[PDB]
Design an enzyme around this catalytic site. Structure first.
Site, PDB file in Angstrom:
ATOM      1  N   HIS B  41       9.949  20.073  87.401  1.00 57.38           N
ATOM      2  CA  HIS B  41      10.687  19.581  86.239  1.00 57.38           C
ATOM      3  C   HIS B  41      11.104  20.682  85.253  1.00 57.38           C
ATOM      4  O   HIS B  41      11.774  20.370  84.266  1.00 57.38           O
ATOM      5  CB  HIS B  41       9.970  18.433  85.521  1.00 57.38           C
ATOM      6  N   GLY B 143       4.217  22.153  76.141  1.00 59.50           N
ATOM      7  CA  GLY B 143       4.205  23.541  76.599  1.00 59.50           C
ATOM      8  C   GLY B 143       3.070  23.855  77.571  1.00 59.50           C
ATOM      9  O   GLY B 143       3.032  24.948  78.149  1.00 59.50           O
ATOM     10  N   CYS B 145       2.466  22.299  80.462  1.00 58.59           N
ATOM     11  CA  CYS B 145       2.810  22.043  81.865  1.00 58.59           C
ATOM     12  C   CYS B 145       2.717  23.301  82.709  1.00 58.59           C
ATOM     13  O   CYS B 145       3.085  24.385  82.242  1.00 58.59           O
ATOM     14  CB  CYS B 145       4.189  21.413  81.978  1.00 58.59           C
TER      15      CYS B 145
HETATM   16  C1  LIG Z   1       4.007  12.227  76.158  1.00 59.87           C
HETATM   17  N1  LIG Z   1       5.216  12.721  76.792  1.00 59.87           N
HETATM   18  C2  LIG Z   1       6.409  12.179  76.574  1.00 59.87           C
HETATM   19  O1  LIG Z   1       6.564  11.174  75.883  1.00 59.87           O
HETATM   20  C3  LIG Z   1       7.598  12.884  77.205  1.00 59.87           C
HETATM   21  N2  LIG Z   1       7.324  13.491  78.495  1.00 59.87           N
HETATM   22  C4  LIG Z   1       7.574  14.934  78.547  1.00 59.87           C
HETATM   23  C5  LIG Z   1       6.779  15.580  79.681  1.00 59.87           C
HETATM   24  C6  LIG Z   1       5.291  15.560  79.327  1.00 59.87           C
HETATM   25  O2  LIG Z   1       4.593  14.568  79.504  1.00 59.87           O
HETATM   26  N3  LIG Z   1       4.829  16.697  78.765  1.00 59.87           N
HETATM   27  C7  LIG Z   1       3.538  16.929  78.249  1.00 59.87           C
HETATM   28  C8  LIG Z   1       2.443  17.302  79.029  1.00 59.87           C
HETATM   29  N4  LIG Z   1       1.185  17.415  78.581  1.00 59.87           N
HETATM   30  C9  LIG Z   1       0.968  17.174  77.296  1.00 59.87           C
HETATM   31  C10 LIG Z   1       1.977  16.804  76.373  1.00 59.87           C
HETATM   32  C11 LIG Z   1       1.727  16.575  75.000  1.00 59.87           C
HETATM   33  C12 LIG Z   1       2.740  16.244  74.153  1.00 59.87           C
HETATM   34  C13 LIG Z   1       4.051  16.109  74.608  1.00 59.87           C
HETATM   35  N5  LIG Z   1       5.054  15.739  73.652  1.00 59.87           N
HETATM   36  S1  LIG Z   1       6.622  15.357  73.878  1.00 59.87           S
HETATM   37  C14 LIG Z   1       7.401  16.771  74.557  1.00 59.87           C
HETATM   38  O3  LIG Z   1       7.174  15.121  72.580  1.00 59.87           O
HETATM   39  O4  LIG Z   1       6.667  14.308  74.850  1.00 59.87           O
HETATM   40  C15 LIG Z   1       4.332  16.305  75.945  1.00 59.87           C
HETATM   41  C16 LIG Z   1       3.307  16.672  76.861  1.00 59.87           C
HETATM   42  C17 LIG Z   1       6.965  14.792  80.958  1.00 59.87           C
HETATM   43  C18 LIG Z   1       6.839  15.422  82.194  1.00 59.87           C
HETATM   44  C19 LIG Z   1       6.918  14.675  83.353  1.00 59.87           C
HETATM   45 CL1  LIG Z   1       6.747  15.478  84.887  1.00 59.87          CL
HETATM   46  C20 LIG Z   1       7.118  13.312  83.325  1.00 59.87           C
HETATM   47  C21 LIG Z   1       7.259  12.679  82.104  1.00 59.87           C
HETATM   48  C22 LIG Z   1       7.198  13.411  80.917  1.00 59.87           C
HETATM   49  C23 LIG Z   1       7.339  12.709  79.630  1.00 59.87           C
HETATM   50  O5  LIG Z   1       7.417  11.496  79.575  1.00 59.87           O
END
Ligand SMILES: CNC(=O)CN1C[C@@H](C(=O)Nc2cncc3ccc(NS(C)(=O)=O)cc23)c2cc(Cl)ccc2C1=O
Ligand SMILES: CNC(=O)CN1C[C@@H](C(=O)Nc2cncc3ccc(NS(C)(=O)=O)cc23)c2cc(Cl)ccc2C1=O
Ligand SMILES: [Cl-]
Lengths: 305, 305
Positions: B41, B143, B145
């Protein structure tokens, strides 16, 4: 999201761990530049431990009585001196893996990572805190002496603890890297005991702020308290006094969540009175006191949920 | 004495962490030999994540679109390919710090250390367990990931997890290093939820053995149980079933403490039905399930790496 007991990455410290041997005694040493630091009790036999005269034991040793092993390489000791309860062995090779470092003496309530070692080989890393009674609740077996505690805010390692002994209650005592003990302990096998321990109030408040940042408010109430009334109640539960320094330190967390420090103090008073009633806070059924205000800001998001 | 949530020393993994950037997206990569592994991703914008066609997005990307930074050095990408949900970037330089390693897929209940990273720089290390619902209760911010999970056996790093996302409950989901997700999750911004979780029974029993080894014996009783009767109780409290494999695995701990596994099950049944009655076990008011039987033996024996 999430909140874990998190240690600093240990790589910078792993590259400094060596094995120090003096006769039958083997323990760990910390190799920085051309010096190996280790507990001075490496020069003691089991029969020397009740009332050792370290100055008299040390004068009888030469450089070649100290065997220092770094990986599969034997280092050459070219000098030695004692500073308080630490022995400093000058070696003929500077450690090429020496990180940027400082020696810092910490105060009770401070947290740090411990790299538990045996025979100069790292076995694990865990996070802990200097208790108000100056002990640490570590996880250490025989041979762990010389294992160190540290923080790595940015890329500089601040060494704050060197392990020396285990007290009868199973808790641990040690020194800073200048060999000064934390607490009223001595590196003797004489009868010694940890004093009554207390809970680190400022850290519990920091962890309640972490719970609010992560999206939980169940424990809050509509009340506030004076600092004096909070201290009068909290001391009945063996909590450390909260000072104006602690209130000032919690300011940033208060501004981020919108909950005044004395309002969070009222929530803590109520938790101490009621217990959790089957609920948890950040996955714990007890009030956690081994996260400082600085740890909470470092680990948590800057945007409250 | 003592019992802590202990992670493996992280140094061998710290030497593999890099920063991967593609357009506006920056995340972490794992550099082993001449390949950098990262979540696929990284090629997605926020709009693409709604419904991404990764092959179609990838075909437009050239090698120079991927910016890989190892410390203060920019690596040269000379090839790229996908394997399931992981992107593999071939680079022109083999990592000189590549440890002896394997890629292993773990099962629920198994534990591992996570090296949380941001911008290719390690920030912390913590221990965690793959939950029965295939999520991990990690501590991760935006950040993170590409941060990885691992175990160490002797001098070999077994990589078992790469971080991809956070679910709405604040728990985390990711893949093995071959890009296969743990759990019924997909790498896209869509409605996804963690299933109902259960407690890892074999790990709670291992932790009760650790408490006994450490002098906490108040929960022991004179009773035993059958495996079938215990599993009726486990089903009632949302505990995972205990198998004969689990009983065999706990054999060494049973022989060391003198408490048969089914004897410890009778203690666990009484704890589930009556609670702790104001008491704690190893400093916890909850039954801890993130230490395996192997973790308990390792920490109570001092195995080094
Ligand atoms: C909670 N996340 C979201 O609402 C958005 N989101 C982005 C991304 C994701 O989960 N990254 C994150 C990973 N670990 C901790 C995280 C804390 C916080 C965070 N915040 S954010 C940027 O505002 O979503 C993201 C975080 C993602 C990757 C994949 Cl492969 C699939 C789905 C998603 C996704 O839905
Ligand atoms: C529990 N300790 C003892 O009964 C003997 N003892 C040895 C030594 C000491 O504490 N080492 C240990 C350090 N850390 C964890 C340990 C777990 C267990 C353990 N067991 S043992 C083999 O029987 O001492 C020793 C451990 C020590 C050093 C100093 Cl500078 C001062 C006093 C002592 C001392 O009293
Ligand atoms: Cl301090």
């Amino acid at each position: 999201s999430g909140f874990r007991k998190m240690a600093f990455p240990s790589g910078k410290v792993e590259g400094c761990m060596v094995q120090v041997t003096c006769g039958t005694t083997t323990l760990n040493g910390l190799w920085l530049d051309d010096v190996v630091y280790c507990p001075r009790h490496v020069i003691c036999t089991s029969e020397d431990m009740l009332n050792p005269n370290y100055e008299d034991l040390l004068i009888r040793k030469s450089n070649h009585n100290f065997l220092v092993q770094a990986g599969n390489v034997q280092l050459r000791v070219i000098g030695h001196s004692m500073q308080n309860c630490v022995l400093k062995l000058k070696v003929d090779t500077a450690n090429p893996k020496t990180p940027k470092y400082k020696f810092v003496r910490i105060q009770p309530g401070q947290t740090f990572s411990v790299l538990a070692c045996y025979n100069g080989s790292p076995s694990g890393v865990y996070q802990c805190a200097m208790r108000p009674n100056f002990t640490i609740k570590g996880s250490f077996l025989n041979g762990s002496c010389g294992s160190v505690g540290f923080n790595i805010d940015y890329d500089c390692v601040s060494f704050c603890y060197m392990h020396h002994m285990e007290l009868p209650t199973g808790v641990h005592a040690g020194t800073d890297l200048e060999g000064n003990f934390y607490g009223p302990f001595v590196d003797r096998q004489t009868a010694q005991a940890a004093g009554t321990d207390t809970t680190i109030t400022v850290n519990v408040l920091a962890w309640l702020y972490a719970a609010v940042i992560n999206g939980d408010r169940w424990f809050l109430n509509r009340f506030t308290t004076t600092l004096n009334d909070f201290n009068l109640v909290a001391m009945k539960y063996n909590y450390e006094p909260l000072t104006q320094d602690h209130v000032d330190i919690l300011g940033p967390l208060s501004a981020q969540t919108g909950i005044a420090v004395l309002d969070m103090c009222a929530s803590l008073k109520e938790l101490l009175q009621n217990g959790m009633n089957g609920r948890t806070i950040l996955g714990s059924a007890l009030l956690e006191d081994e996260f400082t205000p600085f740890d909470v800001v470092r680990q948590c998001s800057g945007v409250t949920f």
